[PDB]
Amino acid sequence: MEVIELNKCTSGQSFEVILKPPSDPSLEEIQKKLEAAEERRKYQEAELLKHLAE
Amino acid sequence: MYTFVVRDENSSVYAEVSRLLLATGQWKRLRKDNPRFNLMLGERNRLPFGRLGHEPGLVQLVNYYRGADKLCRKASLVKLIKTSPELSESCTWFPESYVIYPTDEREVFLAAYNRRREGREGNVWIALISSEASELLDFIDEQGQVHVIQKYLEKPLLLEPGHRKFDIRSWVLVDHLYNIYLYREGVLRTSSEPYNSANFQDKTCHLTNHCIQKNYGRYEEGNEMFFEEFNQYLMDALNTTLENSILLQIKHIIRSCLMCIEPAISTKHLHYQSFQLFGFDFMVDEELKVWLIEVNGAPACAQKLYAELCQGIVDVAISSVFPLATSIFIKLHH
Amino acid sequence: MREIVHIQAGQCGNQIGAKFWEVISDEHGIDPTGSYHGDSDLQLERINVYYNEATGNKYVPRAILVDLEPGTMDSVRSGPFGQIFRPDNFVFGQSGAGNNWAKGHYTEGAELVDSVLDVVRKESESCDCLQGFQLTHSLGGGTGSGMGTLLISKIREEYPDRIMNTFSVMPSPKVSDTVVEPYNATLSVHQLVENTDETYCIDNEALYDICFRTLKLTTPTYGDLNHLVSATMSGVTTCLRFPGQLNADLRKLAVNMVPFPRLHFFMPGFAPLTSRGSQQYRALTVPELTQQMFDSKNMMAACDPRHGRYLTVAAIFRGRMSMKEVDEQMLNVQNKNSSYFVEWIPNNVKTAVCDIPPRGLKMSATFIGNSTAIQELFKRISEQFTAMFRRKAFLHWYTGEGMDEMEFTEAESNMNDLVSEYQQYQDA
Amino acid sequence: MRECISIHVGQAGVQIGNACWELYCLEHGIQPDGQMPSDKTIGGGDDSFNTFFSETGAGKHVPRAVFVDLEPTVIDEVRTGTYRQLFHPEQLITGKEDAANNYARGHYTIGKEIIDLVLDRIRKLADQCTGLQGFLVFHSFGGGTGSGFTSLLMERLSVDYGKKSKLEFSIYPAPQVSTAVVEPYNSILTTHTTLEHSDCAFMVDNEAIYDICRRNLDIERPTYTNLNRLISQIVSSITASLRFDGALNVDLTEFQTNLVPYPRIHFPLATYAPVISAEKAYHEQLSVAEITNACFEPANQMVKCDPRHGKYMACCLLYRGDVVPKDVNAAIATIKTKRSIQFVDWCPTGFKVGINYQPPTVVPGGDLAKVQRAVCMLSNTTAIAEAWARLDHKFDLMYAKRAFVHWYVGEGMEEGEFSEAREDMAALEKDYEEVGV
Ligand SMILES: Nc1nc2c(ncn2[C@@H]2O[C@H](COP(=O)(O)OP(=O)(O)OP(=O)(O)O)[C@@H](O)[C@H]2O)c(=O)[nH]1
Numbered sequence A: 001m002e003v004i005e006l007n008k009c010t011s012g013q014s015f016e017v018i019l020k021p022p023s024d025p026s027l028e029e030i031q032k033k034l035e036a037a038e039e040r041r042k043y044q045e046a047e048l049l050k051h052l053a054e
Numbered sequence B: 001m002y003t004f005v006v007r008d009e010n011s012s013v014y015a016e017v018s019r020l021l022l023a024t025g026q027w028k029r030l031r032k033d034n035p036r037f038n039l040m041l042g043e044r045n046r047l048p049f050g051r052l053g054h055e056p057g058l059v060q061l062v063n064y065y066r067g068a069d070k071l072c073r074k075a076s077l078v079k080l081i082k083t084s085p086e087l088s089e090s091c092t093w094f095p096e097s098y099v100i101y102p103t104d105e106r107e108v109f110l111a112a113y114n115r116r117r118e119g120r121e122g123n124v125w126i127a128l129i130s131s132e133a134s135e136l137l138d139f140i141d142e143q144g145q146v147h148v149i150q151k152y153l154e155k156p157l158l159l160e161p162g163h164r165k166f167d168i169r170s171w172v173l174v175d176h177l178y179n180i181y182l183y184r185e186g187v188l189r190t191s192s193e194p195y196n197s198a199n200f201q202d203k204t205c206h207l208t209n210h211c212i213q214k215n216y217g218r219y220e221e222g223n224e225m226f227f228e229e230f231n232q233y234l235m236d237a238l239n240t241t242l243e244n245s246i247l248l249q250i251k252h253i254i255r256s257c258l259m260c261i262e263p264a265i266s267t268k269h270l271h272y273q274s275f276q277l278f279g280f281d282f283m284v285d286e287e288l289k290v291w292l293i294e295v296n297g298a299p300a301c302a303q304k305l306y307a308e309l310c311q312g313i314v315d316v317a318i319s320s321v322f323p324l325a326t327s328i329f330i331k332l333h334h
Numbered sequence C: 001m002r003e004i005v006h007i008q009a010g011q012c013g014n015q016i017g018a019k020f021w022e023v024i025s026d027e028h029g030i031d032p033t034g035s036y037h038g039d040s041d042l043q044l045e046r047i048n049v050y051y052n053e054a055t056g057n058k059y060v061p062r063a064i065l066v067d068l069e070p071g072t073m074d075s076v077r078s079g080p081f082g083q084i085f086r087p088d089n090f091v092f093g094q095s096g097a098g099n100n101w102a103k104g105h106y107t108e109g110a111e112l113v114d115s116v117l118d119v120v121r122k123e124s125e126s127c128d129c130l131q132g133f134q135l136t137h138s139l140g141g142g143t144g145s146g147m148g149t150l151l152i153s154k155i156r157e158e159y160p161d162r163i164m165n166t167f168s169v170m171p172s173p174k175v176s177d178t179v180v181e182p183y184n185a186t187l188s189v190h191q192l193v194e195n196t197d198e199t200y201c202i203d204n205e206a207l208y209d210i211c212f213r214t215l216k217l218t219t220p221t222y223g224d225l226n227h228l229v230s231a232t233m234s235g236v237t238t239c240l241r242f243p244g245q246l247n248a249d250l251r252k253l254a255v256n257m258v259p260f261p262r263l264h265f266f267m268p269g270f271a272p273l274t275s276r277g278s279q280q281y282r283a284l285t286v287p288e289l290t291q292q293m294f295d296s297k298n299m300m301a302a303c304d305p306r307h308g309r310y311l312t313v314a315a316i317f318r319g320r321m322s323m324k325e326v327d328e329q330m331l332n333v334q335n336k337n338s339s340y341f342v343e344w345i346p347n348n349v350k351t352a353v354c355d356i357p358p359r360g361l362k363m364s365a366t367f368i369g370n371s372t373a374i375q376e377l378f379k380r381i382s383e384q385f386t387a388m389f390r391r392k393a394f395l396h397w398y399t400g401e402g403m404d405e406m407e408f409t410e411a412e413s414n415m416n417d418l419v420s421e422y423q424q425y426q427d428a
Numbered sequence D: 001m002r003e004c005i006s007i008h009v010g011q012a013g014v015q016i017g018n019a020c021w022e023l024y025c026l027e028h029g030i031q032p033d034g035q036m037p038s039d040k041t042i043g044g045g046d047d048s049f050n051t052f053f054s055e056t057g058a059g060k061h062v063p064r065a066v067f068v069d070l071e072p073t074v075i076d077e078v079r080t081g082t083y084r085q086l087f088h089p090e091q092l093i094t095g096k097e098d099a100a101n102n103y104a105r106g107h108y109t110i111g112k113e114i115i116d117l118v119l120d121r122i123r124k125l126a127d128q129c130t131g132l133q134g135f136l137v138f139h140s141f142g143g144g145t146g147s148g149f150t151s152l153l154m155e156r157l158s159v160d161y162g163k164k165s166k167l168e169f170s171i172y173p174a175p176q177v178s179t180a181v182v183e184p185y186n187s188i189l190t191t192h193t194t195l196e197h198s199d200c201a202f203m204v205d206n207e208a209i210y211d212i213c214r215r216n217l218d219i220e221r222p223t224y225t226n227l228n229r230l231i232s233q234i235v236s237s238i239t240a241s242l243r244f245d246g247a248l249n250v251d252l253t254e255f256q257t258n259l260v261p262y263p264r265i266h267f268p269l270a271t272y273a274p275v276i277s278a279e280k281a282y283h284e285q286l287s288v289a290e291i292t293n294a295c296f297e298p299a300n301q302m303v304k305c306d307p308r309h310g311k312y313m314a315c316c317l318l319y320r321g322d323v324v325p326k327d328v329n330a331a332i333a334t335i336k337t338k339r340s341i342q343f344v345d346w347c348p349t350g351f352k353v354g355i356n357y358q359p360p361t362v363v364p365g366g367d368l369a370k371v372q373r374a375v376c377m378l379s380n381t382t383a384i385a386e387a388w389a390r391l392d393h394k395f396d397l398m399y400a401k402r403a404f405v406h407w408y409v410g411e412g413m414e415e416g417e418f419s420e421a422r423e424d425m426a427a428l429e430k431d432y433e434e435v436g437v
């Protein structure tokens, strides 16, 4: 019903119409997660090359 | 071949619907958690509406309207009325009802108790049934849950011989297109023990519930009067017909209730599709004025009427969406 | 992820292998000379997957030819497309493996394996981005069975992070050379479970039955069998060979088809089924192709898919056809037969349509299915194994090459493990 | 003037990026070779379009964009495409082998080797920025790269540019245009890692876009191009206020203010109207009332869900074309009385309206017809959680049997991360519950 904050210009116009009132991990933490996953890859590859050695 | 799932344990109605669907030889029931269905006969609580109408190559239909709980839960129905301009407090087919929360409208409730005290006229309300205001408030906080305080109909229509009380159940099917179908057969749940006039404390003659009544089966079989026997009684006792005196108001109450919620619940332009069977509970008084008690989301049907109504659901709610490779309902036009 | 290295080992391996290169060279428009002669740029856009660009604009199949017997590899060299193969890539022994897995894996084939790996390495070093390897071989012989699985094991050690793909030919009494074929197959399966990423289970029983019952040929040859093999092999490689709406990839197939690392044995399937030379004139409609490719009559492994459940399916349709009709039919199969697909892997069928049809057929369809019904194939081999092994029969051919009874019990156990593992998900 | 950097990750990100930058060029009158005749301050400037395009002494206008894929095929088509001169090759980054539909391969394995090169190329564009405000990230939920690499990049961008705002444009997976069976896994994994690092996220369900192309554009089987030209229209509508003179949504911080009250619940539903076929011969042009009414039809939404069964927290209406405030207010008045628009008790039942008089631009030859007026409604509704429930259930089916898990564990990821990601999602579902019912 009420039309507030009406701004006009050449490009267009904008407004608000209210009908009713109311009632992060660090760089070191990233590297420690990424490298621990490379450790588990390297362990699995080594265990595979150990099995193939046998 | 069409595919369906059953997810309701208790539903004797949709147990019969699934039975009739398999019997046609074109519907295969799948396991409960199989997502690849045409039809869902879903659960009473927490139905996963958000999952429906998302499987490619399948038209999906469900036996519940989402948001229809706003008409079927006691506290919701009262709020919808005293809110929906389509109805508003200026109602005549509904009784004076109030919502009370246990530790809200208590300022409004006490103002109605005072003005009824002023004229000294009947000040009786319902949940047990009592006359005093503060002797009922102790019951609400004792039980735990939120309950509704409704104006008790002190002068109801009485069946003779017996000097009794009754309530009418109507079965209403709303299809995917939002056609409102009223089933031509209803039922009268009767109290065999004569209705007490002054004493409020009595239990069996005041409430007419099939479960709580079980004098059982004294006048008619299982305290249930069908529509032909009640029409005949009204013709002899009151010189009028069931069609004129009671049924016109019933049709108006059903139509007004579902028209109100249509913008909120209709599946007209949705990815999934809804039908629903409703149970409307009515009350006829001495002056043949019809009152609404409540609406049932998962209604139970009368034992003699199962085979015809469940075939009717298959006919206009299911086979209209899924054709097979006449009308037992009254359409309430809008 | 582009270059695939193809290896063919033994009599069956080289015969189905030669036929594959014969079929796919025609599809990419390559003559026996190695020169391109086709009339479409779409034939060359992914030719780097299986061909190497030669001196003066010629293509050379990236492949390696392996046998312990010089017999079969001479037949390839003198055959129709024999001149296309790089001469250096022919690696042969002399004395043969005499249907002996032990001779293949441990003794005769141990001598030759390092020569093969030098050829593999020379081919792998040329590759811009190596995808992995594909082996064609039977599991009933000595060379393809014994030495094939040895090569696999050695290739895995040198290239631990690449894909292992096999076209493994399963033996059947209906098309049987020696009595010791159930032994060779069981020892080979043990290896494939551990060391391959994807295995197409081409079953000789199924190929025979298709040739006998469906194709109405009374006495089928190996050529009649290998016609069906090459038709399937083309079909299951189409997406890697031609551009599509999905960037098709041997790793992406493994990731999407294999829910559990051991269960990586696929039922290949083809529609329509056709005998050699004799052409069909009525082109099949999209609903007909879809109905056939899922029917057990059209499966390359003699298992009844109704006896099990599909874990994952991949389908490839070839021809000029309505892509919407393909989607509709594929969804109709899944919605009419939803019990035969597992509920616990949502949307477990993927479909592709390629515009280029195979030779002869106007429109065709190829099936790749990871069904639990494949246990029937392994149970069959297991039953034939026990019949002999309960009396230690024919075992002296193996123990004389240094093998022990222990290794046979281990192989039997691991196959029975795989059977009960597939069984676990047919109830889940 | 504050600049915005666009990051496009994976096939879906890159290709949607293509359609968007193609469209931005047609709107601002910028040609394939980067020239702009309408621009008078050659060499630089601080106009509203300069938010997205930087200038060179040659007179070229270069997109403030970086395209990253772990695989050459897609970006090579940018390098050889019709807008090849528009970008300097340093903006276009490609690896050797892709993440093969695997989140863990994109996040941990192939991510680690390329991450430092990407952040360095981002810094190279950030150092051309006199006052950078933040980023727009274009990706898929279901790709290996799209889920894996994006989540890592979002983590790192919170370290290197903590002050700045991040915005997501995400492609929610649909079986109708699927590429992978593990798309539910990838989707839950990425959301968990991205949720705290994303300020506002625009979900585009491929199902909804596919159906709009079928229903309103009469295409039997929509291509990726068909979807991308439609998605870019919606993207353009959302980003228009940053590229054009206006007073609503002038910066990325204002997107958070206007659309995101609760920081976790940051998925506003976009709805667009009208989508009209170009090959359609006779069309009656739709009014302000008609197009606003379409914003409340589920068929026109970017995600199929029912906002009648949920609550609003914020509502933006963004108009392009012949639209005046009088006609808008009259449409809102009529709609409010007919439809179930329920807000949360702690929010004003309001609409923030923005109009740009220049009607939406279409790609010549494309499927979208020229219209006199169009609207994009951005509404933060709790109904979007339906898309979460759908995806979570699909996750639950596979994970119950630990199916495909080995592919992730085999890339160094731990099985515990799956169930950590899933419990975060179940927390999010119940956050929407508290607000919604
Ligand atoms: N709308 C749209 N969706 C796309 C497009 N390309 C892919 N997708 C969707 O994105 C998902 C797969 O993600 P992609 O971007 O193809 O995968 P990627 O990020 O390249 O990751 P990998 O290839 O697995 O390394 C699927 O759900 C596709 O439907 C596109 O151009 N437009």
Ligand SMILES: Nc1ncnc2c1ncn2[C@@H]1O[C@H](COP(=O)(O)OP(=O)(O)CP(=O)(O)O)[C@@H](O)[C@H]1O
Binding pocket: B095, B126, B127, B150, B151, B152, B153, B154, B166, B167, B206, B207, B208, B209, B281, B283, B293, B294, B295, B296
């Ligand atoms: N305001 C009122 N005046 C008169 N009688 C009333 C009343 N409210 C309830 N009743 C009686 O009490 C009975 C119970 O109805 P109510 O809806 O309160 O419980 P209920 O929900 O278990 C019945 P149903 O199972 O059919 O929904 C009715 O049969 C009716 O006759």
Ligand SMILES: Nc1nc2c(ncn2[C@@H]2O[C@H](COP(=O)(O)OP(=O)(O)O)[C@@H](O)[C@H]2O)c(=O)[nH]1
Binding pocket: C009, C010, C011, C012, C013, C015, C016, C097, C098, C099, C100, C138, C139, C140, C141, C142, C143, C144, C145, C169, C170, C171, C172, C175, C176, C177, C181, C204, C207, C222, C223, C225, C226, C229
């Ligand atoms: N389908 C098919 N099967 C074959 C062919 N040649 C041999 N076999 C089967 O392969 C098994 C013997 O393997 P073979 O390759 O001849 O021995 P190898 O050379 O020592 O490996 C037997 O079970 C045969 O049925 C062939 O050309 N086609």
Ligand SMILES: COc1ccc(/C=C/C(=O)c2ccc(OC)c3c2OC(C)(C)C=C3)cc1N
Binding pocket: C236, C237, C238, C239, C240, C244, C246, C247, C248, C249, C250, C252, C253, C256, C257, C312, C313, C314, C315, C316, C347, C348, C349, C350, C351, C352, C368, D178, D179, D180, D181, D182
């Ligand atoms: C369970 O659903 C799926 C099954 C398979 C895929 C595979 C995607 C591919 O990249 C791919 C790779 C190699 C191929 O040749 C053997 C194929 C292949 O896939 C298609 C459909 C294109 C056909 C064959 C994906 C999903 N989701």
Ligand SMILES: [Ca+2]
Binding pocket: D039, D040, D041, D042, D043, D044, D045, D046, D047, D055
């Ligand atoms: Ca300038």
Ligand SMILES: [Mg+2]
Binding pocket: C011, C141, C177
């Ligand atoms: Mg032989």
Ligand SMILES: [Mg+2]
Binding pocket: D010, D011, D071, D098, D143, D145
């Ligand atoms: Mg990719």
